[PDB]
Assembly symmetry: C5
Homo-oligomer: 25 residues x 5
Amino acid sequence: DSQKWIVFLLFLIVLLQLAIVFLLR
Amino acid sequence: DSQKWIVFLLFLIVLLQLAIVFLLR
Amino acid sequence: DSQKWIVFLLFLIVLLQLAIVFLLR
Amino acid sequence: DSQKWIVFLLFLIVLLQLAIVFLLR
Amino acid sequence: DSQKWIVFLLFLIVLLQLAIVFLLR
């Protein structure tokens, strides 16, 4: 099922975006 | 279901992207 | 429909990424 | 359908993000 | 299917974000 994969990849994207925000400030 | 999680994570992504933009500016 | 929310949020992300590209120049 | 726009947006994001990478290094 | 395209593009976005995080460090 690709739905669970999509949600997992979105979660990774959110985590990395938060990492980028932390890096900027 | 999965759609709720996908929309919620997209909301989080947009908020983080706004944070990134506001930090750049 | 959740598809409308997904498309709209991706549109917002596209705008925000365009803004990031503009601010990085 | 609306799905065709999702992909259309998603790849766009990818392209912009690639530009972002080159805009940092 | 096109969900496979979605997953593939999400993985590319994750790789690009990881490249961003590694470049910034």
